[PDB]
């Protein structure tokens, strides 16, 4: 039987092999499974049940070792170095929160979520108790809803007749355990106080109506510590807002309902028309809250100085961008951004670079990529939400060269897992829906609690190990 020379190596701190064990002969036809079983065995790592993947020259093994050597035109006596890593636990389907209309946005309140941590300050916001996590959904019907994890609605925002949104909501987030922000087609951002009584009953009351945008407000990011909000609008502008009455300035009267050309109505701290096409995303720098990044259908990622409104830097990518997310990396002040495009791929960028590559592409979605959420567990993975009806999980540790079909420039990373729309998967059909028909994903968030995704099938879907 044919053999292959293998050297094992790893970056997992707890899983180092003793030196005499690292170099080994294995059957040439062994695959990931067999290699994984070897590491778990008693004579090796003795971990028993840990699924491993293997990096060879920077990309995951997905074949037998014999085939890897064949496909790369290597000698039979080639020694392969296999960097083993812990693989992602599959996030399988758990539950659906049924809605009457399309779900445009989802967010999660847990002790470890951003709003939970901002609440842990305990500075007028109560800490999130374990077991009492909350899920926020926003709908095209114009209403916000708060769910417990078991899937009961605890609270629903008031209608347009009672101080609520007067048109479809496009975006929403928790600032803290008792404060939320939302935005949509009525050109407003609303700030809400949330109170809960007997754990199954709650109330959302508007505290601010924020005016400034002259088109749909399609995306929002929040900072619950400083009580600030960033918006991106179809008007091509980036908005910067205080979420507190003590700091929100007076509004442009010409934008108010009833204007001829009771919640407090206020304007922005800043409103900057920096994009020549719809602005689609705006986020705080995770490490420096005076810095923001925006993305737009005009193909650019811009870096903003929030103290001045100045565009500090402009990257021009090759396609319209529909989404932006920051990855936080140990040892580095500058994030790595994921930018989801209208051309179905995701581009990874360092916002402090020249436009011309100064490059990694995430390929696999069959439609627009409109939502992104970094893994809460580490710094090399994230989940994307797409109008193709899927959410895809990516591992950036794995990158292969691009093929000519992919422009032959840069590295390409493929998904490690695909989360199907359960409403379609439970049909037991092989034909996926074309053009996201009835199943577009509009929003995904990845919490320790799980991966939550909402869209056109009118459900928040819950996936987790």
Partner 1 sequence: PSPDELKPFPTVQQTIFRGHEGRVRSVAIDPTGVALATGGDDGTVRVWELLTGRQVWSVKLNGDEAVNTVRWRPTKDTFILAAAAGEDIFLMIPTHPSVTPALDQASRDILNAGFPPGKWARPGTRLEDEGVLLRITVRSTIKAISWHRRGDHFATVSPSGQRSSVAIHTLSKHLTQIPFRKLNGLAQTASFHPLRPLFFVATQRSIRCYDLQKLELVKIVQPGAKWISSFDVHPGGDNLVVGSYDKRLLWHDLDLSNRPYKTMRFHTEAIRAVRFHKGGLPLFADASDDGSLQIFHGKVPNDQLENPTIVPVKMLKGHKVVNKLGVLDIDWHPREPWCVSAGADGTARLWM
Contact pattern for partner 1 over residues 282 through 301, marking x by CB under 8 A: ---------------x----
Nearer to partner 1, 242 or 443 (CB): 443
Q: Is 190 in the site for partner 1 (CB under 8 A)?
A: no
Cα separations (Å) of 44 from 30, 35, 38, 100, 324?
A: 17, 11, 7, 54, 42
Q: Is 322 in the site for partner 1 (CB under 8 A)?
A: yes
Which range binds partner 1 by CB under 8 A, 306-314, 372-380, 428-436, 445-453?
428-436
Which range binds Na ion by CB under 5 A, 191-199, 264-272, 408-416, 418-426?
418-426
Q: Which residue, chain included where needed, has tokens 């995904």? A: 444
Which range binds Na ion by CB under 5 A, 16-24, 117-125, 216-224, 416-424?
416-424
Residue 421's binding partner out of partner 1, Na ion, none, with CB under 5 to 8 Å set by partner kind: Na ion
Hey, which bits of 149-237 come out as E strands? 153-156, 169-176, 179-184, 188-196, 202-211, 217-223, 228-233
Residue 387's binding partner out of Na ion, partner 1, none, with CB under 5 to 8 Å set by partner kind: partner 1
Residue 224's binding partner out of Na ion, partner 1, none, with CB under 5 to 8 Å set by partner kind: none
Q: CB atoms < 10 A from the CB of 275, how many?
A: 23
Residue 424's binding partner out of partner 1, Na ion, none, with CB under 5 to 8 Å set by partner kind: Na ion
What CA–CA distance (Å, rounded) separates 399 from 411?
6
Q: Is 421 in the site for Na ion (CB under 5 A)?
A: yes
Nearer to partner 1, 36 or 296 (CB): 296
What CA–CA distance (Å, rounded) separates 53 from 155?
43
Which range binds partner 1 by CB under 8 A, 88-96, 249-257, 306-314, 415-423?
249-257
Residue 322's binding partner out of Na ion, partner 1, none, with CB under 5 to 8 Å set by partner kind: partner 1
Which range binds Na ion by CB under 5 A, 132-140, 240-248, 329-337, 412-420?
412-420
Nearer to partner 1, 184 or 206 (CB): 184
We find the least distance from the C-beta atom of residue 443 to partner 1, in angstroms, to be 12
Q: Is 424 in the site for Na ion (CB under 5 A)?
A: yes
Residues 379 to 398 in contact with Na ion, rule: CB under 5 A: 389
What CA–CA distance (Å, rounded) separates 171 from 104?
7
Cα separations (Å) of 312 from 258, 291, 292, 344, 352?
A: 38, 10, 10, 28, 10
Choose which of 2, 7, 89, 256 interacts with partner 1 (CB under 8 A).
256
How, if at all, do strands 217-223 and 153-156 pair?
unpaired
Q: Is 420 in the site for Na ion (CB under 5 A)?
A: yes
Residues composing the chain:
465
Beta-bridge partners for 445: 452
Nearer to partner 1, 313 or 367 (CB): 367
Q: Is 234 in the site for partner 1 (CB under 8 A)?
A: yes
Structure tokens at 3: 């053999």
Contact pattern for partner 1 over residues 336 through 375, marking x by CB under 8 A: ------xx----------------------xxx-x-----
What CA–CA distance (Å, rounded) separates 383 from 371?
8
We find the least distance from the C-beta atom of residue 440 to partner 1, in angstroms, to be 7
Contacts of 121 (CB under 8 A, 6+ apart): 225
What CA–CA distance (Å, rounded) separates 210 from 227?
14
Residues 96 to 135 in contact with partner 1, rule: CB under 8 A: 102
Q: Is 417 in the site for Na ion (CB under 5 A)?
A: no
DSSP 278-339: -EEEEEE-SS-TTEEEEEETTSEEEEEETTT--EEEEEE-SS-EEEEEEEP-TT-SS-EEEE
Of 286, 288, 289, 292, nearest to 272 (Cα)? 292
Residues 67 to 96 in contact with partner 1, rule: CB under 8 A: none
Contact pattern for partner 1 over residues 402 through 421, marking x by CB under 8 A: --------------------
Q: Which residue, chain included where needed, has tokens 């701190």? A: 13
Structure tokens at 334: 């500058």
Q: What angle do CA 305, 106, 282 make, to 5 degrees?
A: 15
DSSP 222-254: EETTTTEEEEEETTS-EEEEE-STTTPPPP-GG
Which residues contact Na ion by CB under 5 A?
A: 389, 420-421, 424
Which residues contact partner 1 by CB under 8 A?
A: 102, 140, 167-168, 184-187, 214-216, 234-235, 254-257, 259-261, 277-278, 297, 320, 322, 342-343, 366-368, 370, 387, 434-437, 440, 442, 456
């Amino acid at each position: 039987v044919a053999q292959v020379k293998v050297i094992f190596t790893t970056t997992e701190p707890d899983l180092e092999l003793p030196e005499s064990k690292r170099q080994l002969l294995v059957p040439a036809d062994i695959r990931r499974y067999g290699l994984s079983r070897i590491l778990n065995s008693e004579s090796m790592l003795d971990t028993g049940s840990i699924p491993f993947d293997f990096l060879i020259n920077g990309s995951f093994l997905r074949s037998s070792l014999e085939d890897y050597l064949t496909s790369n035109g290597l000698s039979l006596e080639t020694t392969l170095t296999l960097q083993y890593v812990r693989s992602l636990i599959p996030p399988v389907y758990e539950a659906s929160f049924e809605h009457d209309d399309w779900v445009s946005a989802v967010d999660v309140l847990s002790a470890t979520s951003p709003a939970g941590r901002w609440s842990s300050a305990a500075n007028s916001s109560a800490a999130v108790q374990p077991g009492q996590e909350r899920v926020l959904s926003a709908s095209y019907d114009g209403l916000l809803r708060i769910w417990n994890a078991s899937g009961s609605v605890i609270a629903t925002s008031p209608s347009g007749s009672h101080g609520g949104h007067t048109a479809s909501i496009k975006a929403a987030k928790f600032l803290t355990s008792d404060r939320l922000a939302s935005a949509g087609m009525d050109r407003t951002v609303r700030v809400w106080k949330y109170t809960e009584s007997d754990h199954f009953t709650g109330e959302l009351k508007p505290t601010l109506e924020l005016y400034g945008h002259t088109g749909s407000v399609d995306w929002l990011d929040v900072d619950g510590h400083s009580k600030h909000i960033l918006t991106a609008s179809a008007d091509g502008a980036i908005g910067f807002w205080s979420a507190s009455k003590a700091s929100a300035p007076e509004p442009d009267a010409s934008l108010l309902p009833g204007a001829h050309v009771s919640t407090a109505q206020r304007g922005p701290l800043g409103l900057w028309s920096i994009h020549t096409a719809p602005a689609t995303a705006a986020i705080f720098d995770p490490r420096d809250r005076t810095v923001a990044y925006s993305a737009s259908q005009d193909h650019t990622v811009r870096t903003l100085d929030l103290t001045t409104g100045q565009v500090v830097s402009t990257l021009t990518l090759t396609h319209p961008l529909l989404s932006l997310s920051a990855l936080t990396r140990a040892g580095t002040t500058s994030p790595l951004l994921a930018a989801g495009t209208s051309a179905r791929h995701i581009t990874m960028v360092d916002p402090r670079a020249s436009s011309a590559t100064t490059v990694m592409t995430l390929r696999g979605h069959a439609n627009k990529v409109v939502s992104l959420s970094p893994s809460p567990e580490n710094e090399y993975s994230l989940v994307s939400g797409s109008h193709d009806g899927t959410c895809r999980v990516w591992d950036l540790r794995s990158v292969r060269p691009a093929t000519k079909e992919e422009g032959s420039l840069g590295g390409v990373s493929e998904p490690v897992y695909v989360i199907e729309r359960e409403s379609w998967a439970s049909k037991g059909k092989k034909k996926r829906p074309v053009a996201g028909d009835g199943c577009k994903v509009f929003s995904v968030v990845w919490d320790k609690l799980g991966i939550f995704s909402g869209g056109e099938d009118k459900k928040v879907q819950v996936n987790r190990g």
